[PDB]
Amino acid sequence: LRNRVTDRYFRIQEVLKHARHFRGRKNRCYRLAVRTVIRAFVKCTKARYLKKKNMRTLWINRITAASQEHGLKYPALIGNLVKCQVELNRKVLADLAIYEPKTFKSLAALASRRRHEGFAAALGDGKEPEGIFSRVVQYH
Amino acid sequence: IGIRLTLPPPKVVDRWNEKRAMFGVYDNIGILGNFEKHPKELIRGPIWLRGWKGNELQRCIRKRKMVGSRMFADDLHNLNKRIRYLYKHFNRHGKFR
């Protein structure tokens, strides 16, 4: 019995279909396209880490841009919102800085007020009571 | 390219022809016939392969000593060379010792 490949056409079309949008001979020649489709798939897997990294970097720039309009720096906003137990991530703050400018200014005022409270507490030796917004809600 | 554009001609197989309906018959001739006959005696084919099994080298060696005097000169010369090559391959080449 002699066996020959009869469905070799279907084995090469499943790889060439991913290369139809390429440029040059690497969209129709199986030998050339297979080495490009594999690299395209490899870049697809490794770009999932970059997309998460790039989104956060984009959010930081947008948060920084809006903070400067209110005379604040990015470390001064994120750092002082943590001490108020306001757990808002960069995704929300970037959205708030774009679609809710009035709400973002309220957060900037809260962060600025909390920032000023820490400086006042740093000047004292603990005799004066803590700031109004410096109180922390305890959970048991 | 490389694949036909039309369907192959239809093939119909007679599952109840004379050969298939009577295939495997008398395979129990020895058990049910007081062991007068052996099922290996029902094998039809080369005289050097009836009721015998072996690898390629053993088949060539057995064929040469049974019908070697009846083979054609070209076929006999090819058989002798095949035995020489298989002898060298099996006894000198391989992964295991």
Binding site: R4, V5, T6, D7, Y9, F10 | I3, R4, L5, T6, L7, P8
Partner: peptide
């Protein structure tokens, strides 16, 4: 002429799909 039916049959379905693309039915 390679023997077999599955590959030839499968290719016909693919051709019909291309026919439905070049000349789509109303």
């Amino acid at each position: 002429v390679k023997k077999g039916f599955r590959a030839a049959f499968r290719f016909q379905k693919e051709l019909e799909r291309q026919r439905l693309l070049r000349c789509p039915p109303p």
